[PDB]
Amino acid sequence: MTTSASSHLNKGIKQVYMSLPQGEKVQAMYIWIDGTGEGLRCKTRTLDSEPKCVEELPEWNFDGSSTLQSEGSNSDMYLVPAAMFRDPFRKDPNKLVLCEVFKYNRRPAETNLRHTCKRIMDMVSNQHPWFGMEQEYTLMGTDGHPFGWPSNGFPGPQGPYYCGVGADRAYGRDIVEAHYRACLYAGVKIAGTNAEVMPAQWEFQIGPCEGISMGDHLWVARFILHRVCEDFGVIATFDPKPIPGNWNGAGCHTNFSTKAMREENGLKYIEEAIEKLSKRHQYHIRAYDPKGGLDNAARLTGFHETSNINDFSAGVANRSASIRIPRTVGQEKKGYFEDRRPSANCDPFSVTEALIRTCLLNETGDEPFQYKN
Amino acid sequence: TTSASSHLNKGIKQVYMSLPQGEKVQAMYIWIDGTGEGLRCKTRTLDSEPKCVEELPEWNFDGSSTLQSEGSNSDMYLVPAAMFRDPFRKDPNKLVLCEVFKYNRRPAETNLRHTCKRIMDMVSNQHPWFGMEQEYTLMGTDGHPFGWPSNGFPGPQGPYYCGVGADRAYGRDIVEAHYRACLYAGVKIAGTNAEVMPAQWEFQIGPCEGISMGDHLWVARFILHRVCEDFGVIATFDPKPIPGNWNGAGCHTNFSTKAMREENGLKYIEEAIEKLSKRHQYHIRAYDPKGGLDNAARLTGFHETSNINDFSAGVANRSASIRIPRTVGQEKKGYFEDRRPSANCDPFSVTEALIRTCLLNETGDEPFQYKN
Amino acid sequence: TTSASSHLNKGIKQVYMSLPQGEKVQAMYIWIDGTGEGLRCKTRTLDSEPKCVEELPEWNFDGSSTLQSEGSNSDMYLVPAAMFRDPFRKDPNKLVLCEVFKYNRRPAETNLRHTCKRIMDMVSNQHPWFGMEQEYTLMGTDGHPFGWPSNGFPGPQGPYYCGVGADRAYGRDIVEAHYRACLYAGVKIAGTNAEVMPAQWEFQIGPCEGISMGDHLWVARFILHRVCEDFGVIATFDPKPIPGNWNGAGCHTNFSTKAMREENGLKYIEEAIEKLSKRHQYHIRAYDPKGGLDNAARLTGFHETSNINDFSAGVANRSASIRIPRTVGQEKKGYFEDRRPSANCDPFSVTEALIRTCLLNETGDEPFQYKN
Amino acid sequence: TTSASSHLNKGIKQVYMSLPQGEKVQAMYIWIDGTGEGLRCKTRTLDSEPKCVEELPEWNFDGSSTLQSEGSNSDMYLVPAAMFRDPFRKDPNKLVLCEVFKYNRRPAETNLRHTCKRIMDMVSNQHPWFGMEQEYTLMGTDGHPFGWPSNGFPGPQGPYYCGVGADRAYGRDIVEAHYRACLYAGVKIAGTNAEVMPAQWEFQIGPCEGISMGDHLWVARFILHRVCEDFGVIATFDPKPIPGNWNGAGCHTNFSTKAMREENGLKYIEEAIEKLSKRHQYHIRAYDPKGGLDNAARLTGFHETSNINDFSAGVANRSASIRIPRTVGQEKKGYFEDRRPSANCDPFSVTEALIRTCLLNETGDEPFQYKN
Amino acid sequence: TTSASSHLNKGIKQVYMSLPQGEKVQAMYIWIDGTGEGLRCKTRTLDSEPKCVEELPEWNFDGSSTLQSEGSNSDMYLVPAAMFRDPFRKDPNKLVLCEVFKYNRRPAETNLRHTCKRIMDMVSNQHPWFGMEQEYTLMGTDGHPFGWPSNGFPGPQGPYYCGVGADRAYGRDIVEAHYRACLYAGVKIAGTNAEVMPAQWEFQIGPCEGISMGDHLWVARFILHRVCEDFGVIATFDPKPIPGNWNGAGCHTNFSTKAMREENGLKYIEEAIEKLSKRHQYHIRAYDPKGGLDNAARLTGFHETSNINDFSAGVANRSASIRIPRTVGQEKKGYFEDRRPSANCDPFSVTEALIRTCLLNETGDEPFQYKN
Ligand SMILES: Nc1ncnc2c1ncn2[C@@H]1O[C@H](COP(=O)(O)OP(=O)(O)O)[C@@H](O)[C@H]1O
Ligand SMILES: Nc1ncnc2c1ncn2[C@@H]1O[C@H](COP(=O)(O)OP(=O)(O)O)[C@@H](O)[C@H]1O
Ligand SMILES: Nc1ncnc2c1ncn2[C@@H]1O[C@H](COP(=O)(O)OP(=O)(O)O)[C@@H](O)[C@H]1O
Ligand SMILES: Nc1ncnc2c1ncn2[C@@H]1O[C@H](COP(=O)(O)OP(=O)(O)O)[C@@H](O)[C@H]1O
Ligand SMILES: Nc1ncnc2c1ncn2[C@@H]1O[C@H](COP(=O)(O)OP(=O)(O)O)[C@@H](O)[C@H]1O
Ligand SMILES: [Mg+2]
Ligand SMILES: [Mg+2]
Ligand SMILES: [Mg+2]
Ligand SMILES: [Mg+2]
Ligand SMILES: [Mg+2]
Ligand SMILES: [Mg+2]
Ligand SMILES: [Mg+2]
Ligand SMILES: [Mg+2]
Ligand SMILES: [Mg+2]
Ligand SMILES: [Mg+2]
C-alpha cells in the first residue's frame, strides 16, 4: 500500500539472473531530459565492444510525439551523447550516457539549455569557475504521503529530526546509503549527505565542479536517485513544498567561485560579484524557475530558514539572507559564497549560465545578450 | 496478484541448484504447438556435451495432447534445428529448437520453417537481413495488467514512454533479467524500451541473416515466458491487450539486402517498396496466424498506426504502412521498416512473404508451388 | 510493531553496498546535541584515508536546528576528537566523534569533554582506569517493550536473568550484532548479559584510561542506536522504562588507580571511599543530566539499589551505594564500584566528579574554577 | 478509508436511543466560526418544549477557541434566529441557528446575516425568491474520493451523470439519509441528482423568500455534515477537489421577484440582467468567501465555464455567466439563473449582493452604508 | 483498538434482554473504592419494586479484596443513600449509591459523604446551589486516545472545539448514549460539548442543592463507565492524559446561594470571593483526591489555567482562578465560577470545602471538629 507492487517481486530471482557472465556485448543506457523541463527518459542499446571515450558512441533517435517535444509528421528527434559514466545498476563494462536533444532540422530543442551553457563556459574558460549545489528531496510512498509517516496523521513536532539517528528519527536511510555508494561507483562528484528538518527529508551535495560538468553531474545524480528509489519502491520528489503547513520546504543552494576569489584577498572579488548580483534580482529569480517564476514564489516566503522573495539581501554568516558568505571565508579573506534562492526543482544549466552572465560578463538589462558576451 | 508457485521459497531452489552436476548433460527440446502461437518443452539427459546441433538425436511426443494429430497415428517427431546455451541451468546444458513432422515424415501444419528455409536458400547470394521489434504486456494472474490499480486505471498517457521511477515503469526486473538471459544464451538482442502505457515494453532483435531470424525470435519468446514464470506473471503478445483508448501492440520488421546496403541502395529500396505496394492483401493475410483477423486489432489508424484498408509509404511518416528512416533518406543506403505485422505474428511466414514479394518478383494471390 | 523502514527488502541494499567504491573515503561526524542526551550525525567525502585523527578537517552545522543556538549567529563548529573504524561501511571509512564550540570559539553548554580532559591531564601520572555497565531496554515503535504481549505482560520475574530460549530472551540478534560491530570498530567492549525483565540487556566497557572512557561509551551508544535503527526497534536508556514492580536501569561505574592496583591498595580504596562519603549530594547532582531529577526515580531500595538520601558502603552488599567486590577484599587490591549513576548519565561528568572528589581532595558545593 | 468511530457497534447506540427521555428537552445551537465556512455546535437541556424561536434563551461560547476573539475579552454571545426539528434525536428536540456577537454587542466579522436581514426588510414588499444548487464531493478519511480505486482512477466521464448501478453511483445511502432528514427537519430540499463524476452529488434548496434562503442552506449543510459523520465519510465543498480533467463544483443561484413572476416579467428579467452586466468584479468579489481568491480554480474557459474576467448572458446557454431557461423565455415570465458562485459561497452575501445590485440600483464599488 | 468483549454479537444479547421479566426486580449497588476515585458494583434480586430508597436493605462486601480492610475483620457494610432508574436494564430495575462503613460501624476512610451531609444540613437554611463541569478523554484499549493515528498525532489545535464532521469529532456515539441514559436515569445532565482536542469531551451536571450534587456526579461517572464498557473504550479523568501541547482536563465548580441569586447579590458574591482569597492552599489540598499531588501537572500557566500558588479573580477572565460571568456582573445577580479543581476531584470534598470557607467562614488550617 505504501510501496509499489513491483517492489514486492522476489529480488533473489533477479540477482540470480544478474549473476550470469555477460560475454562480449556491452549495454549502454541513453538518458535525456523531456519536454516538461524536469523529467527524465531512458532506453537501452547493445554495442559490440566497450567504448573508451564518449566520442566513440553513436547517435540515436526517439519518437518526440510521445514525449511532448514534437508534433505532426516531423516527430523524430535526435540524441547526441554528451557525457559518459560507469553503470552501477549493471556493472562494468556497461555505461550510462547523457545526451542532448535536437529537432529534426538539427536545431536544439526548447528544453535543451546545455548548448548555450557550454557556449558561455567556453567563453569564460580562462577564469576556472567552480560550482557546488545542495539538492534536497522528500521520500514519498505510492499513496501520496511521505514515506513512514503515520497513516492519515503526522509525526511529532520538529526539532529531533535534523541529522538524527534512530528508528524514530530517520526514515529511509537505506535509499540514502545505496544512492551514495552508487554515485561513488559511477563517478559522480558527490560530496556528502545529511538528514533534514522533517523526517523522510534528506539532502546530498555535489561538487566542486568546473564549467559544464556541474549540470551533467547533477542530472546524472538525479537519474541515479530515481532509479534507486524505483528499486526500493518509493518516490523521490523535488517539489519545493512537498507538504502544506508549518513544515519545512525544499531548496537548492548554489556555491560559486573563480580563481581570483580562491586566490589570496579574493574577498574583494566576492564583494564585487555580490554588488553586481544585487542589481539583477528579478532576472535571476526568473532564471532559477523552470516554469518562469511559479515555483520560486512557492518556495521563497521567509520561513523554514529561507529568505523573502520581496527584496535582495546579503550578509556574512546570515542563513536568512538571499546571499550568504560563510564565516570561515570571511575570516580568511578568501573562498566562495552561497546563493540560497534557487528552488529544489531548478535547472543547473540555467542557474550556472545566469550566474556566469551576471558576475563575469557584466551583462545588464532584462534579456540575455544574443550572440556574444 | 501473482501465481502461487511464485510464493514458494526460492532460496531452497538456489541451494539445490548450487550442487555440482557431474558428467551428465541436460537438454530441453522446444517446439511450436498446433495453435501456431504456443510453445511446448520437455527435458532429457545426454551422456556428454554436444559440440554442434548435428550431434543431437531425434525425439518424439504425443500429438493428441497438443491438438496436432488424431486417431491411432498420434506420434509426432522432433528434429533439432538450432542450439543455444541454457540460461536457467548454465553450462554445459543446452536449449534446442526443433521442427515438427507427422508420423509419415511430412511437415506439420504449423511447421513453416521447412518452406521458409527452402526459400531462403534460393536467394542466399543476396544476404538478406532482418530485424524485428517485439511488443508485449505484463499481466497479473487475475487478468489485469501488472501493477495497475485494482479494478481501476492509472493516470493518462504521456509520462510512461521511456519513463523512470516507481510511478512510471512497472516490472523492470523482468526486463533486466530477460536481457541478461538472452545475452547469455546467445540470442541477437539489440535493445529495449518502455512503451506508451505502463506495464508495456518492447525488445528488438537483429540484424539476423536468413533463417536465423525466426529461430532467434522464437527462442527469445520462450526465454521471456520462462522468466515471467519464475517471477509469477504472464506475458501476452495480444495485439489489443486492454480495450479502449490505450495503446496496442505490434511487431515492426526491418529488411535490407547487400544491394540496399551498398552505396546508392536507396534506388533498390524504392523498387522493393514499389513492388510491395501491389500485394497489400497478400501480405496482410501472411502477417496473421489466423489468416487475416488479428490485423484489424492494431491497424485502426490511431496512436501512430496506418489504416488497414489502404497502403501508404513515406520517409518520416510514423503513421505510414512503410517507413524509410530519415537517416537512410539522407544517406542513400540502409534499410526500411514495415509496420503492418501484428505482435503475435510468425517470423517464418513474415520473412518468407517479404522475400517472395521483393526478391522473387512473385505475383498473384498464392505462393508459387515449386520454382519460387 | 517495527518501523516501516525495516520492511524495505534489505537484499537490495546489500547488492548496492557490495560495489568496490573506488578511491574516495566516507567520514561520519558525530556530536552531542543541546538536550545533553541525544546524538546527531552527517557524512562527508575525503580524497584519501586519514592515518590519524589530527589530519581530519573541521566542519560546522546549523545550531538553530538542534536548540544549541539562537539568532543570526547560529553557526557552530565541529572539532574532531577521536576516530574509529566504521562497521556500517567497512574499511577504509571512519567514524569521527567531535566536540562542539560556539561561533566565538567558546565551548558549548553540553560540551563537557573540554573541562573533563583539562582535569584528567592533572592526574595522568596516577593512571586512573574506568569501567561502566550500560543498561537498556528494547522497545517497539508503539511504545511498549519489544516482544511483550499486546496490551499485556509476560510472566513474573525470575526466569529472564541470563536466560536462554524463545520464551526467556527477547531480541538477541541486536545484542550479537552490536557486540560484533563494537569489536570491529575498536570500542573496548568487555561483555554482555540479559537482565531481570525480558527485552532488557546490558553491556560493559573498559577498563579505559583517562578521557578515552567517555568517548568509548558515547561511540558504543551511537553504534547501538544505528544497529537498532537497522532492525527497526528503539533502544532507550530511560532509568524507569516501565511502571510498576519491574526493575530500573543503572550505569554502575568502576574506578581504580595505580596505587589501588598495587599490592595493599585496599587502604587507598578505603580512603577514597571515606572521602566520597562526604559529597553525596554533589555526586548525585553530577550523575544526572538534568541536575538530579531522573536519579530519584531509580534509587528506591528495590532492584538491588540503595536509598537516594542515604550513603552506605560494603563489601558484598549489592544494595549499598558503594560496593567492594569480595575478591578485591580478599586480595587487598583491585577496584571498587559506584552504583549511583543512572542509565542516562554523562560519562564525562561522572568521571570528572570522581577524579575531583577522590584524587584532588576537592571540597565544597561547587567545582574549583580555574585549576584543580 | 472510513473513520474509526464508524466501526463501532451502532446497535448499542440504537438501543440507548430507544429509551423514552421524559419531560426534558434537548436543544442544539449552531453557528458559523471565524473562517467563514466552518460550523460549530453544542447542546443544552431545556425544561419544556419551546413552540417559538423567541422562547429560546441566549448563550455564549469561548471565542478564543474558534479564532474569533483574543485577549481577556474572549467571550462571545449568540442569539437564536431560526428553529427546526432535530432529525438525529427526533421530536421534541430541536435545532437552533444563531448569530454571533462580540463582548460588546456588535456583530462578529463573519456575521453577514445582520446586514442581509436589514437589506431584505427594506425590500420585502417585492417578495424576492431564491433557489440554490449545492454541489459537493464525498471523500474518505485518507484524502481521496470515496469509492475510488486506491491510488488510481475510474473510467472516463459519461456514465456517472444521473447514474444507477454499483459501478456508476457511489454512496447513495448518504444522499437518501440527508434527503429524508431534511424533509423531517423542515429544511426546503427541492431535489437531488448524481453529478458528472462518481462520489459527486447535488441537492437544490427549494424556492425560499428573502432571508430564509441563507438559513435553510446553512442548516442543510450542517445536516449533511452530521449524516456524513454518522457514515464515516467527509463532505467537501471545495470548488476543485480533484485536479485534472475531472468535473469541478459550484453553487448556482436562481432569482425572481413578483414582477418577474407576473405576466410579461421577461422585460424585468432583462432589466435585472442589464443592471448586473456592469457589476461583474463586485459580484465576483462578493461570491468568494475570502475576497475573490478561490473561484479562479474552476472558472477557466473550459467544461462549459465562462471566462472569469468576461461577463455574458443568453437563453438556454449553459456556457454563459447568466442563463435564461428556455421555458421562461417561451412563457415571457419566470426567473433567471446566475452560474458564477462557487461551492463554498456564503448565501447571505450572495443574496445581499443580488438585492443591492438589481433592486436598490447600487453602482459603487463598496456597499452603501444606509440603504442606497 | 477496542476490547475483545465489544466484538461479541450484540444481537444475541438484545434477544435475551427482550424476554419479559416477571415479578422480581434487580437492584445494582454502587460504592466508592479504597483509592478514593474508583467505583465498584454488584447486583441482588428483590421480591418487589421499592418505592423509596428507605425500602432497600443493607448489604456487605469483602473489604480485603478492595484494599480498604485487612485481617479477619475484613467485612464491610454499605448503606444505600440514593436511588435512580436503571438505564441498562429498564424499569422497574434500579441502581443504588451507598455509603461504606467498617465492621465497627465507623465510616470508611474514603467515605466523605458522611461529613459533607452534616455540613450541608447545618447550612441548609441558605439553600446552596452547585454546578460542575466534568471533562474527560476517550482512550482505546491500547493506551492511546481513541481515533488517533497509530503512533502519530492529528493536526494542530483549532478545528476540534465544538466540532462536527468525521475528521473533527471522535466518538460522538458514546456522548449521545450517555446523555440519553442520564436523562432516563434521572440525573441532572445540563449539557455537553466537544473539547479542544479530538476524543475529549465535557458534560455539565445541572444546578443541584446540597449533597445531591455529589450524588448526581458520582452516578453520572458510573453511567459513563458502563456505556464506554458497552462500546469497548475507556474513559479517563486523568488531569494530563497526553503530554505535550495538548489540552488538559479540569472540573470547574459553580456556586451560589439564595442571597447571591436574589437582587443585589453581587455584593455577597464579592464577599465570598474575598473570603476564599485567603484559603488558597487549603482549597488546593482539598481539591485533590491524593492530597495535593495530581493537580500540579495541570496548573502550569498554560491551557488558560491559573497559577498554582498565585490566587487571582476577575470578571470574564478565563485565566483567573475565580471568574465572574459578564452577565452576572451586568445583572448584579447570579453565581461565580471556581476553575481550580481538576478532573478527578471528589465532589463531596469540593462542596464541603466551599461551604466551610464561605458560609460559616472557617479560618484554621484543619476542618473544625464540631458544628462548623
Ligand atoms: N571553492 C569552492 N567553490 C565552490 N563551491 C565550493 C567550494 N568549496 C566547497 N564548495 C561546495 O560547497 C558545498 C557545501 O555544502 P554544505 O556544507 O551542505 O552547505 P551548508 O553548510 O550551507 O549546508 C559543497 O557541495 C561543496 O562542493
Ligand atoms: N541494415 C539493417 N537491415 C535490417 N535491419 C536493421 C538494419 N540496421 C538496423 N536494423 C534493425 O532495425 C531495428 C530498429 O529498432 P528500433 O530502434 O526499436 O525501431 P524504431 O527505430 O523504428 O523505433 C533494430 O532492431 C535493428 O536490428
Ligand atoms: N582494575 C579495574 N579498574 C576499573 N575497572 C575495572 C577493573 N577491572 C575490571 N573493571 C571493570 O569492571 C566491570 C565489571 O562489570 P560487571 O562484572 O558486569 O559488574 P557486576 O559484576 O557488578 O555486574 C568491567 O566492565 C571492567 O571493565
Ligand atoms: N420561480 C422561481 N423562483 C426562484 N427559484 C426557482 C423558481 N423556480 C425554480 N426555481 C429554482 O430553480 C432550481 C432548479 O434546479 P435544477 O433543475 O437542479 O437546475 P438546472 O435547471 O440548471 O438543472 C431549483 O433549485 C428551484 O428552487
Ligand atoms: N444559579 C446557578 N447556580 C449554580 N450553578 C449554576 C447557576 N446557573 C448556571 N449554573 C451552572 O453553570 C454551569 C455552566 O457550564 P458551561 O456553560 O458549560 O461552562 P461555562 O459557564 O464556562 O461556559 C452549568 O453546569 C450550570 O449548572
Ligand atoms: Mg547543506
Ligand atoms: Mg547551504
Ligand atoms: Mg522500436
Ligand atoms: Mg520501429
Ligand atoms: Mg554487570
Ligand atoms: Mg555492577
Ligand atoms: Mg441543477
Ligand atoms: Mg443550474
Ligand atoms: Mg463549560
Ligand atoms: Mg467553565
Numbering used by the authors:
A (entry chain A): 1 to 373
B (entry chain B), C (entry chain E), D (entry chain F), E (entry chain G): 2 to 373
From the primary publication:
Here, we demonstrate that human glutamine synthetase (GS) can reversibly polymerize into filaments aided by a composite binding site formed at the filament interface by the product, glutamine. The glutamate/ammonia binding site is gated by a flexible loop that bears two key catalytic residues: R299, which interacts with glutamate substrate carboxyl group, and E305, which is predicted to deprotonate ammonium ions to ammonia, enabling the required nucleophilic attack of the y-glutamyl phosphate intermediate. We propose that GS filament formation constitutes a negative-feedback mechanism, directly linking product concentration to the structural and functional remodeling of the enzyme.
To test the model that loop biasing impacts KM values for GS, we structurally characterized the decameric form of loop variant R298A under turnover conditions. Importantly, this map, despite being the highest global resolution map reconstructed, did not display any appreciable E305-loop density, similar to the turnover filament. Thus, the R298A mutant, even in the decameric form, would rarely adopt the active-closed conformation, explaining the KM, glutamate and KM, ammonia defects resulting from this mutation. However, the two loop mutants, R298A and L300A, could not support growth under glutamine-deplete conditions displaying the same phenotype as P242stop. The KM, glutamate for R298A and L300A are outside the normal steady state concentrations of intracellular glutamate, suggesting that loop conformational control of the Michaelis-complex can occur in the cell to directly impact metabolic flux through GS.
